[PDB]
Amino acid sequence: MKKYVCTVCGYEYDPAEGDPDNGVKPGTSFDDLPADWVCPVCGAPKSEFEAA
Ligand SMILES: [Fe+3]
């Protein structure tokens, strides 16, 4: 349930919440996001998130 933060915009990916409108149900770990997922607030890539 390790949260990750976007280092562009500060958005926090929270595995307990997922990202439904991008097809990520609640409970999905950050490491299991789809290869094409990007930060939903700013568009940044997953390579620019850090553990939070
Ligand atoms: Fe972002």
Side-chain angles (χ1 to χ4, degrees):
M1 287 269 149
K2 190 173 268 325
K3 305 179 292 308
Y4 284 64
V5 58
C6 180
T7 67
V8 177
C9 77
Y11 166 88
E12 212 179 33
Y13 179 76
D14 176 4
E17 290 169 3
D19 186 29
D21 77 334
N22 290 303
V24 178
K25 65 187 184 313
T28 305
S29 77
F30 182 81
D31 285 340
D32 290 327
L33 289 165
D36 57 18
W37 184 101
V38 295
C39 180
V41 166
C42 74
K46 291 182 288 313
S47 68
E48 287 180 355
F49 280 64
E50 63 178 10

